[PDB]
Design a protein around this ligand. Structure first.
Ligand SMILES: NCc1ccc(C(F)(F)F)cc1
Ligand SMILES: NCc1ccc(C(F)(F)F)cc1
Length: 330
């Protein structure tokens, strides 16, 4: 079987992408943030503390004829940005763009952090990292992808994120019309539970390509590109008036500047991020200082190829027994 769903930016900056997902019988449609950096499928629900819900669509297990409470199971998750949520666990039928999984763990939020409450457009997350990171206790649960794998024509999913525009998540097949040239595949380490790989280097604008190994994760659930301090300093040094601001928490630049592109290596191939993708607009309404889309990973502990990088490519998540990541220009 296969599935295909359109994913849409939540705002004018592409801060995140939501994808409609059908849960329960009859279907309850929720817009979830597909996150290859985590492994929990959790939703705002009728069980979520009322004061912590602000416009989200909620899942109501009591109205689903296929929902079953998973007795004794709980979940609690903390994201690298300080966000967190927790609750209990149902199993239910979950469908993405025609692809159906029965008995998927649906984690019902009883408590959500403030960052989630304030994001009215995101009804929950759909984790797509490896199932070893799932937080359900005492019995770990599988991701939507792991549960679908056997039924898929090919054990793959692909992310085709748009720049200020809708894109596509496909499950089970590779759309050969969606990219140009060839797909370059590169090895993945699952030892930390992430889609972790090694980039072969970078270039700034029209500069010389620097061959150097950058280990990092492919994370659709992170907005920006987080890279080592040396690389990030080399990029922003090419932007007149750019500086790191401690009060803002990253590199900022004059909104009147033009940004150079950024190239990253995948094996022998190159993915080019246009400079406009790196502009995240004024730091506050009316400001002439703009926030940069390439930031240092020094405080984080791991390099993150977030949406800024991924939306410049067609990306294959190959969940074969030896997993790989594929990148193609588009
Ligand atoms: N998008 C999920 C996610 C968020 C943060 C991290 C970090 F910070 F631990 F690298 C990994 C994955
Ligand atoms: N990386 C997972 C993640 C995704 C979105 C959010 C937000 F936007 F809701 F804060 C936090 C954490």
């Amino acid at each position: 079987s296969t599935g295909s769903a359109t994913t849409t930016p939540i705002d004018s900056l592409d801060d995140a992408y939501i994808t409609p997902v059908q849960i329960g019988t009859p279907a309850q449609t929720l817009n979830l943030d597909f996150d290859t950096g985590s492994s929990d499928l959790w939703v705002f629900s009728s069980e979520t503390t009322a004061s912590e819900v602000d416009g989200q669509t909620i899942y109501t297990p009591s109205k689903s004829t296929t929902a079953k409470l998973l007795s004794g199971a709980t979940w609690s998750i903390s994201y690298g940005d300080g966000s967190s949520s927790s609750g209990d666990v149902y199993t239910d039928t979950v469908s993405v763009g025609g692809l159906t999984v029965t008995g998927q763990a649906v984690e019902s939020a009883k408590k959500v952090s403030s960052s989630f409450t304030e994001d009215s457009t995101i009804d929950g997350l759909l984790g797509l990292a490896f199932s070893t990171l799932n937080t359900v206790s005492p019995t770990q649960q599988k991701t939507f992808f792991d549960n679908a794998k056997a039924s898929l024509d090919s054990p793959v999913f692909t992310a085709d994120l748009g720049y200020h525009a809708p894109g596509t998540y496909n499950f089970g097949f590779i759309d050969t019309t969606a990219y140009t040239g060839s797909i370059t595949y590169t090895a993945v380490s699952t030892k930390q539970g992430f889609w972790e790989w090694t980039s072969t280097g970078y270039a700034v604008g029209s500069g010389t390509f620097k061959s150097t190994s950058i280990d990092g994760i492919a994370d659709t659930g992170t907005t920006l590109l987080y890279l080592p301090a040396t690389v990030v300093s080399a990029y922003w040094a090419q932007v007149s008036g750019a500086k790191s601001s401690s009060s803002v928490g990253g590199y900022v630049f004059p909104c009147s500047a033009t940004l150079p592109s950024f190239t990253f290596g995948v094996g022998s191939a190159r993915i080019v991020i246009p400079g406009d993708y790196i502009d995240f607009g004024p730091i506050s309404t009316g400001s002439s200082s703009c926030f940069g889309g390439i930031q240092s990973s020094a405080g984080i502990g791991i390099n993150i190829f977030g949406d800024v990088a991924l939306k410049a490519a067609f990306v294959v998540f190959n969940g074969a027994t030896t997993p790989t990541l594929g990148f193609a220009s588009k």
